[PDB]
Amino acid sequence: VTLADAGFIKDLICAQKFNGLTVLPPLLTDEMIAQY
Amino acid sequence: NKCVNFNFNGLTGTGVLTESNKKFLPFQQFGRDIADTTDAVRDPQTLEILDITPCSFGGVSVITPGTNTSNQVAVLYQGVNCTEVPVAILTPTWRVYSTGSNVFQTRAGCLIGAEYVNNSYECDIPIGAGICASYQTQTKS
Amino acid sequence: VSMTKTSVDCTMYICGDSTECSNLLLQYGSFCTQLKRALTGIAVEQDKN
Amino acid sequence: QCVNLITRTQSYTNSFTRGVYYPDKVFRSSVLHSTQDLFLPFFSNVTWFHAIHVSDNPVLPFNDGVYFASTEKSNIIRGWIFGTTLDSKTQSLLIVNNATNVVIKVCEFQFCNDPFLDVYYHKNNKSWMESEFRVYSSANNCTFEYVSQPFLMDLEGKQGNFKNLREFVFKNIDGYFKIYSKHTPINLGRDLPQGFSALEPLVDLPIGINITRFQTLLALHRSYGWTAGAAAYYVGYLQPRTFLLKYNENGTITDAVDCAL
Amino acid sequence: IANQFNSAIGKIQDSLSSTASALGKLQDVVNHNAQALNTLVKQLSSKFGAISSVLNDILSRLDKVEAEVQIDRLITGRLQSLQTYVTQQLIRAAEI
Amino acid sequence: DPLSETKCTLKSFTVEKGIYQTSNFRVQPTESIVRFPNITNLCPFDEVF
Ligand SMILES: *[C@@H]1O[C@H](CO)[C@@H](O[C@@H]2O[C@H](CO)[C@@H](O[C@H]3O[C@H](CO)[C@@H](O)[C@H](O)[C@@H]3O)[C@H](O)[C@H]2NC(C)=O)[C@H](O)[C@H]1NC(C)=O
Ligand SMILES: *[C@@H]1O[C@H](CO)[C@@H](O[C@@H]2O[C@H](CO)[C@@H](O[C@H]3O[C@H](CO)[C@@H](O)[C@H](O)[C@@H]3O)[C@H](O)[C@H]2NC(C)=O)[C@H](O)[C@H]1NC(C)=O
Ligand SMILES: *[C@@H]1O[C@H](CO)[C@@H](O[C@@H]2O[C@H](CO)[C@@H](O)[C@H](O)[C@H]2NC(C)=O)[C@H](O)[C@H]1NC(C)=O
Ligand SMILES: *[C@@H]1O[C@H](CO)[C@@H](O[C@@H]2O[C@H](CO)[C@@H](O)[C@H](O)[C@H]2NC(C)=O)[C@H](O)[C@H]1NC(C)=O
Ligand SMILES: *[C@@H]1O[C@H](CO)[C@@H](O[C@@H]2O[C@H](CO)[C@@H](O)[C@H](O)[C@H]2NC(C)=O)[C@H](O)[C@H]1NC(C)=O
Ligand SMILES: *[C@@H]1O[C@H](CO)[C@@H](O)[C@H](O)[C@H]1NC(C)=O
Ligand SMILES: *[C@@H]1O[C@H](CO)[C@@H](O)[C@H](O)[C@H]1NC(C)=O
Ligand SMILES: *[C@@H]1O[C@H](CO)[C@@H](O)[C@H](O)[C@H]1NC(C)=O
Ligand SMILES: *[C@@H]1O[C@H](CO)[C@@H](O)[C@H](O)[C@H]1NC(C)=O
């Protein structure tokens, strides 16, 4: 499964941001989900 | 390499201008991204191609507990490089948090006014990307 | 189990670097707070799920 | 000078993928872009004219743009008339080109009936040039004159039977007249070859007048006396049409879908 | 029983590796999040009955009275594109 | 100050424990620049002046 945007610190990903649309990171990282 | 207002041949906008690895055709003047938004413009006088990206921006989340409990707060500049909020010495008129020694790059954004501690706890206030914040006294040493 | 958290803002989406439109948009009242709140209500729920 | 001696015969052939052109002056990379504009459809039935001289030449319609193609050596094809009346009752646009410079000139021209051009050897100037313009009586008032490099060139050297096909799209809109073109080499395979190539905008001219009809100029050398010759060209007409256009990493239109084929 | 289990776990890897569509229900969510933001950012280029979708084009070419109503159309249209996106998101959040 | 801004965006003198999105930050231009081609085609008004 490919992820379009991770939402991490800064393509269509850029242009979305250019117009104020932002992607927020999940609280639990993929390491914390692997630990659970 | 400086955030500026621009007008090329009547193509008006705002952003940082940077040299481009894109190679336009001789008759083309500007490039549109997948979102059909302008992201390059060819200088009319000397025909080099410049990338445009908007000047930096982001959300500003304030981490405040019960007003009754305390009046001090941290601020998270969302998706922002924590070297760039200092260069952004703007919409938030409160300049003071440009000069903070207690400054931290979370993956979620630049967090200012809260200090990183190596010890871990249950998540009191969520910041994002594994990070949480809390109002308490540490006293380890 | 979850979907991408998103946030947006009328100030930039409807008109970036545009004070004139920013003043016209005030005439429409609370809709932008409703939209921002609704997307924040989705975003906090993705962590909960 | 009103010599009605040129004539032309006609037939039909298939314009497979030809007559696609860059719709705006914009770069795009690896992106599929859709637009509604005057385009020539895929596998459109395209008229095939042969023009000849014997020692009968009807003026052509123009509406919603024309595609014109040809592939003659020595650049015997030399220009066009575009215009409302072509008789000095309303102004009209003349294109003529030679080996070193094209003129774009729009005036109240009385063209007589059939306009051709007459480059011949003059003994006293020891060289080739146009004798007298049989194209028209006289120009009365002119309001725009432009000069530039010949919109058409031959390939370097000359390979045997190796024609280049020359393509033009002519549009009139909002006062402007827009030329698009491409010059593609031909393995000497077939007419309008299989493959793809999009026309670049050559000139984009604020003529400002009204176009309803068009015609083309052929040269004659006057060797002693109008030595007889032949030429070919193809005419297609544009429609208000939707296209999906594919840009490569370099922002050339590499392929297209005709949206109602 | 252990060999049946161990050989069954061996087939999960090959199934997931070979099958293009196996994570379809997760890819679909990622694609709908990407398509919804692409559609929302594309909707900025729509005219909504105005002379142009470019705001400073309007402000340059038209006077304060006329320019304002042209922007209004763009405000009303864009604000519709946001309410649509947020309603689609609130419905899509409920099935997640 | 940023607490005074959260009190304002929540329309209340007492904000509770949490994280609150306030006004978006955005760096304004340092100046404005005009780019148009070389000044070709000067009008032949001089030949008559
Ligand atoms: C191809 O056709 C061209 C136009 O028919 C022709 O250009 C013409 O060139 C002559 C001489 O170079 C010009 O004559 C005038 O030149 C200057 C221009 O200011 C004057 O000072 C001179 O006194 C003289 O009047 C023509 O004006 C010019 N035509 C146009 C429309 O600009 C080319 O020479 C032709 N080329 C060949 C190979 O035949
Ligand atoms: C986009 O433009 C690119 C730059 O012009 C172009 O790259 C070029 O590709 C051709 C064809 O592969 C190369 O031609 C050959 O050159 C020598 C042999 O003469 C070989 O060593 C090369 O590998 C190659 O086969 C050009 O050298 C190459 N130019 C550059 C500067 O890299 C792309 O092909 C263009 N892309 C499309 C889709 O048209
Ligand atoms: C934030 O920006 C700084 C620069 O202000 C980045 O630091 C650069 O990192 C790259 C990659 O390691 C180096 O090649 C550069 O030399 C660094 N520049 C400077 C001036 O130190 C940093 O990587 C960025 N990081 C984040 C989290 O956004
Ligand atoms: C173009 O030139 C012709 C010829 O000089 C002009 O025609 C004259 O126009 C005037 C004004 O309408 C009439 O009174 C004359 O009877 C016309 N004479 C002829 C012979 O046509 C014409 O007006 C000029 N056009 C422009 C735009 O200057
Ligand atoms: C170009 O010329 C044609 C022909 O004169 C114009 O068509 C006329 O348009 C008027 C106004 O609609 C009608 O009353 C006439 O009956 C039309 N004439 C013919 C013969 O169809 C056309 O309007 C002109 N175009 C422009 C842009 O001026
Ligand atoms: C414009 O002038 C500059 C400076 O002389 C020159 O470098 C440039 O090539 C000119 N423009 C074009 C299109 O040649
Ligand atoms: C705030 O703190 C006061 C004591 O300083 C307490 O009486 C009050 O109940 C608190 N309010 C809330 C909402 O917790
Ligand atoms: C955490 O421990 C490292 C040493 O392992 C130390 O260098 C670092 O300063 C500590 N963290 C903070 C934020 O002080
Ligand atoms: C093209 O049109 C002409 C006249 O409309 C017709 O005679 C001819 O058959 C058509 N072409 C083909 C391949 O049918």
Short mmCIF file of N, CA and C in Angstrom, two decimals, chain D residues 38-91:
data_model
loop_
_atom_site.label_atom_id
_atom_site.label_comp_id
_atom_site.label_asym_id
_atom_site.label_seq_id
_atom_site.Cartn_x
_atom_site.Cartn_y
_atom_site.Cartn_z
N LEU D 38 -10.84 24.43 -31.09
CA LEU D 38 -10.92 24.09 -32.50
C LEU D 38 -9.77 23.15 -32.88
N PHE D 39 -10.04 21.86 -33.00
CA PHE D 39 -9.09 20.82 -33.42
C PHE D 39 -9.60 20.06 -34.64
N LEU D 40 -8.68 19.40 -35.36
CA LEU D 40 -9.08 18.55 -36.50
C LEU D 40 -9.23 17.12 -35.98
N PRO D 41 -10.40 16.46 -36.14
CA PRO D 41 -10.63 15.12 -35.56
C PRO D 41 -9.73 13.99 -36.08
N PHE D 42 -9.57 12.92 -35.29
CA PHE D 42 -8.79 11.75 -35.71
C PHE D 42 -9.53 10.98 -36.80
N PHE D 43 -8.80 10.43 -37.77
CA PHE D 43 -9.34 9.77 -38.96
C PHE D 43 -10.41 10.61 -39.67
N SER D 44 -10.21 11.93 -39.71
CA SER D 44 -11.08 12.84 -40.44
C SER D 44 -10.82 12.72 -41.94
N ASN D 45 -11.90 12.69 -42.72
CA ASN D 45 -11.89 12.73 -44.18
C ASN D 45 -11.32 14.09 -44.66
N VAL D 46 -10.12 14.09 -45.25
CA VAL D 46 -9.36 15.30 -45.62
C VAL D 46 -9.26 15.43 -47.14
N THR D 47 -9.56 16.62 -47.67
CA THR D 47 -9.57 16.81 -49.14
C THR D 47 -8.13 16.79 -49.67
N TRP D 48 -7.92 16.20 -50.86
CA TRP D 48 -6.56 16.17 -51.47
C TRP D 48 -6.58 16.91 -52.81
N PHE D 49 -6.00 18.11 -52.86
CA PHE D 49 -5.94 18.89 -54.08
C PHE D 49 -4.64 18.63 -54.84
N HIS D 50 -4.74 18.49 -56.16
CA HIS D 50 -3.63 18.73 -57.09
C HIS D 50 -3.88 20.01 -57.87
N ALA D 51 -2.89 20.91 -57.87
CA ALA D 51 -2.89 22.18 -58.58
C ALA D 51 -1.90 22.11 -59.75
N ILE D 52 -2.33 22.50 -60.96
CA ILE D 52 -1.59 22.31 -62.22
C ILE D 52 -1.79 23.48 -63.18
N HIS D 53 -0.87 23.62 -64.13
CA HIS D 53 -0.93 24.70 -65.11
C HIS D 53 -0.89 24.15 -66.53
N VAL D 54 -1.86 24.56 -67.34
CA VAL D 54 -1.94 24.12 -68.73
C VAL D 54 -1.80 25.29 -69.69
N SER D 55 -0.92 25.14 -70.68
CA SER D 55 -0.69 26.19 -71.66
C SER D 55 -0.83 25.65 -73.08
N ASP D 56 -12.67 26.53 -62.18
CA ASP D 56 -11.55 25.61 -62.40
C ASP D 56 -10.46 25.68 -61.31
N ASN D 57 -10.49 26.71 -60.47
CA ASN D 57 -9.57 26.90 -59.35
C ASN D 57 -10.30 27.54 -58.15
N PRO D 58 -11.41 26.94 -57.69
CA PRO D 58 -12.37 27.60 -56.81
C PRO D 58 -11.76 28.00 -55.47
N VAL D 59 -12.12 29.20 -55.02
CA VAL D 59 -11.68 29.78 -53.75
C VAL D 59 -12.24 28.99 -52.56
N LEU D 60 -11.44 28.75 -51.53
CA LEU D 60 -11.78 27.82 -50.45
C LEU D 60 -12.51 28.50 -49.27
N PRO D 61 -13.50 27.83 -48.65
CA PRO D 61 -14.11 28.31 -47.40
C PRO D 61 -13.12 28.34 -46.23
N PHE D 62 -13.37 29.22 -45.25
CA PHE D 62 -12.72 29.17 -43.94
C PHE D 62 -13.78 29.39 -42.85
N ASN D 63 -13.78 28.49 -41.87
CA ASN D 63 -14.72 28.54 -40.76
C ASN D 63 -14.21 27.68 -39.61
N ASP D 64 -14.15 28.27 -38.42
CA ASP D 64 -13.67 27.61 -37.21
C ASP D 64 -12.27 27.01 -37.37
N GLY D 65 -11.46 27.65 -38.20
CA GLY D 65 -10.09 27.22 -38.42
C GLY D 65 -9.87 26.17 -39.50
N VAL D 66 -8.70 26.23 -40.13
CA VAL D 66 -8.30 25.29 -41.18
C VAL D 66 -7.01 24.59 -40.81
N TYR D 67 -6.90 23.31 -41.15
CA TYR D 67 -5.64 22.58 -41.22
C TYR D 67 -5.24 22.51 -42.69
N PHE D 68 -4.01 22.87 -42.99
CA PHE D 68 -3.44 22.81 -44.33
C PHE D 68 -2.14 22.02 -44.26
N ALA D 69 -1.95 21.05 -45.14
CA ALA D 69 -0.68 20.34 -45.24
C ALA D 69 -0.26 20.17 -46.69
N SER D 70 1.04 20.01 -46.90
CA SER D 70 1.66 19.89 -48.21
C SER D 70 3.06 19.30 -48.02
N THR D 71 3.75 19.00 -49.12
CA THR D 71 5.08 18.41 -49.05
C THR D 71 5.76 18.57 -50.39
N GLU D 72 6.01 19.81 -50.77
CA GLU D 72 6.64 20.08 -52.05
C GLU D 72 8.08 20.57 -51.92
N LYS D 73 8.93 20.11 -52.85
CA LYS D 73 10.35 20.55 -52.84
C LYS D 73 10.44 21.90 -53.58
N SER D 74 11.55 22.62 -53.40
CA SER D 74 11.72 23.96 -54.03
C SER D 74 10.71 24.95 -53.44
N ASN D 75 9.97 24.53 -52.41
CA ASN D 75 9.00 25.43 -51.73
C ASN D 75 8.11 26.11 -52.77
N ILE D 76 7.65 25.36 -53.78
CA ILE D 76 6.79 25.95 -54.85
C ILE D 76 5.54 26.56 -54.20
N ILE D 77 5.08 25.99 -53.08
CA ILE D 77 3.94 26.62 -52.33
C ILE D 77 4.51 27.89 -51.70
N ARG D 78 3.88 29.05 -51.91
CA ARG D 78 4.54 30.30 -51.42
C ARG D 78 3.64 31.17 -50.53
N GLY D 79 2.36 30.84 -50.33
CA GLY D 79 1.60 31.72 -49.44
C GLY D 79 0.11 31.49 -49.41
N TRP D 80 -0.59 32.44 -48.80
CA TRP D 80 -2.04 32.41 -48.62
C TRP D 80 -2.65 33.79 -48.69
N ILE D 81 -3.92 33.84 -49.09
CA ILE D 81 -4.78 34.99 -48.86
C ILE D 81 -5.84 34.55 -47.85
N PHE D 82 -6.04 35.32 -46.80
CA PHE D 82 -7.15 35.14 -45.87
C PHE D 82 -8.02 36.39 -45.90
N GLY D 83 -9.35 36.24 -45.95
CA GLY D 83 -10.17 37.44 -45.98
C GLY D 83 -11.67 37.38 -46.22
N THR D 84 -12.33 38.47 -45.85
CA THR D 84 -13.78 38.65 -46.01
C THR D 84 -14.31 38.76 -47.45
N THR D 85 -13.61 39.51 -48.31
CA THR D 85 -14.08 39.72 -49.68
C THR D 85 -13.01 39.62 -50.78
N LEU D 86 -11.75 39.82 -50.40
CA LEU D 86 -10.62 39.76 -51.33
C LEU D 86 -10.84 40.58 -52.60
N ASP D 87 -11.39 41.78 -52.43
CA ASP D 87 -11.68 42.66 -53.58
C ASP D 87 -11.58 44.17 -53.28
N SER D 88 -10.91 44.56 -52.20
CA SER D 88 -10.80 45.94 -51.68
C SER D 88 -12.10 46.59 -51.19
N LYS D 89 -13.19 45.83 -50.97
CA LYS D 89 -14.42 46.36 -50.33
C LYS D 89 -14.43 46.22 -48.79
N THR D 90 -13.50 45.40 -48.30
CA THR D 90 -13.22 45.08 -46.89
C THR D 90 -11.74 44.61 -46.90
N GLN D 91 -10.94 44.87 -45.86
CA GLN D 91 -9.53 44.47 -45.93
C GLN D 91 -9.29 42.96 -45.72
#
